[PDB]
């Protein structure tokens, strides 16, 4: 280990594979060349800082850089040639042709097994869409376990209006009240709340229906976003039904016209997709992408760490973007919390909510969604209501019937109906 700066030459066409664990802090300063973290180019002579995530730094051109990391040494650095970037560029340029020629931009869905179609493919295409003719594609995340521009348990639609944060596993951040180096994002968020699609499939499908509706409205009113299309990420094939009925719903609600399949040529998924979606999309519009290099498999401990990181980021910001959340004390009487129907609590999960009893077992360290609906609003209104943001219930005091609530925005406690998520955060 060491706290000094070390020189590294990444040859053209290679990935510098980084796996930072726990308390690992890495600073990179590029001297010459073109390097990219999922399509986002690192500016020369500018210091980039990374913490507790795994990613590849791709060398577009032979690159010389300096790096500082005590958890790394010159003799244990992993630099290996990437032979699959060709597949991504060929795809991007095909999409770029559709944005220039056609009446509207393409609406691309990414289907597959491993989450290497996520980040890797999605993020690069998004970074690349902005790179040549300044498009603003709508990035749509349908995997609620994956926190992108928000907290976990959400499905989202975010226009990629400017460069992503190469330093962050979360791609970047939503708008702030002040001044930032990078322009932040303005996402549309739908709260699923539960940890897994299986927990309430009907609710996951209502979320998609709701996001689809607003996406349509945005595309109708926004020429630039309509001219650029959509890039849609889905949950793992394993997480969905055998019939893939959920993809039919996604395709209908999101008006998908192109499908990208990530598997091997031995995988039966390819023919299944061709048979199932071909009659709707047309086979000419279904594409095969082989196993992409650079991206290494991820465990549940890494997933749990990533979920924690995004929750802190929502309230406190990133390392170079210090934000001030606001803590308030409230009486039990001042909150109206609902809980979604789920397989565990209710045997079969339906599109319905249940009132929550203010108990430390129920609400301590809980992430709560704040809706636009009034406290007195009925169940059916609450479930259809847009999300204002999130809050964290820090402490629940039983004797003096009070709660400590952390808000992202300093000011008043919103007098709105709230929804309890399966997500927890301590500190």
């Amino acid at each position: 280990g060491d706290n000094e700066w070390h020189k590294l030459v990444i040859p053209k066409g290679s990935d510098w594979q980084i796996d930072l664990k726990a308390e690992g802090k890495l600073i990179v300063k590029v001297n010459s060349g073109i390097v990219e973290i999922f399509g986002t180019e690192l500016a020369v002579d500018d210091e980039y800082t990374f913490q507790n995530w795994k990613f590849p730094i791709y060398a577009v051109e032979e690159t010389e850089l300096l790096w500082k990391c005590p958890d790394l040494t010159t003799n244990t650095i992993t630099v290996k040639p990437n032979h699959t970037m060709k597949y991504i560029y060929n795809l991007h340029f095909m999409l770029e042709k559709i944005r220039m020629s056609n009446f509207e931009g393409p609406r691309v869905v990414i289907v597959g097994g491993s989450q290497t179609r996520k980040t890797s493919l999605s993020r690069t295409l998004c970074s690349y869409a902005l790179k040549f003719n300044a498009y603003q594609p709508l990035y749509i995340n349908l995997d609620p376990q994956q926190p992108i521009f928000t907290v976990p348990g959400c499905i989202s639609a975010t226009p990629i209006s400017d460069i992503l944060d190469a330093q962050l596993p979360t791609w970047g951040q939503s708008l702030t009240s002040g001044a930032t180096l990078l322009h932040n994002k303005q996402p549309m968020v739908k709260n699923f709340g539960l940890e897994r699609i299986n927990e309430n499939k009907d609710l996951y499908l209502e979320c998609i229906s709701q996001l689809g509706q607003v996406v349509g409205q945005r595309l109708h009113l926004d020429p630039q976003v309509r001219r650029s299309g959509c890039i849609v990420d889905t949950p793992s094939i394993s997480q969905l039904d055998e019939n893939l009925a959920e993809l039919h719903h996604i395709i209908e609600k999101l008006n998908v016209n192109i499908m990208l399949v990530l598997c091997s040529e031995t995988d039966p998924l390819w023919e299944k997709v061709k048979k199932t979606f071909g009659p709707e999309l047309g086979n000419n519009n279904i594409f095969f992408i082989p196993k992409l290099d650079g991206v290494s498999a991820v465990d549940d401990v890494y997933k749990r760490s990533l979920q924690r990181t995004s929750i802190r980021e929502y309230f406190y910001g990133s390392l170079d973007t210090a934000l001030s959340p606001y803590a308030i004390g409230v009486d039990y009487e001042d909150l109206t919390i609902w809980k979604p129907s789920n397989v565990f609590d209710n045997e079969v999960g339906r599109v319905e909510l249940f009132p929550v009893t203010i108990t430390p077992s129920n609400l301590q360290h809980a992430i709560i969604a704040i809706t636009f609906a009034e406290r007195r609003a009925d169940q059916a209104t609450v479930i259809k209501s847009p999300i204002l943001g999130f809050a964290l219930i820090t402490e629940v005091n039983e004797k003096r019937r009070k709660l400590r609530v952390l808000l992202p925005v300093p000011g008043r406690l919103p007098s709105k109906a709230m929804i309890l998520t399966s997500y927890r955060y301590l500190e």
Partner: protein, 33 residues
């Protein structure tokens, strides 16, 4: 409990999200000046 108010000289904060209507009508060129 513990420390109420702003947590950790000029300060900024995360903004609330827009409603469906406000979001549909929003143009990101407002962000990117």
């Amino acid at each position: 409990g513990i420390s109420n108010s702003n947590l950790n000289k000029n300060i900024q904060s995360r903004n609330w999200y827009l409603s469906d209507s406000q979001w549909a009508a929003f143009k990101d060129d407002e962000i990117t000046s």
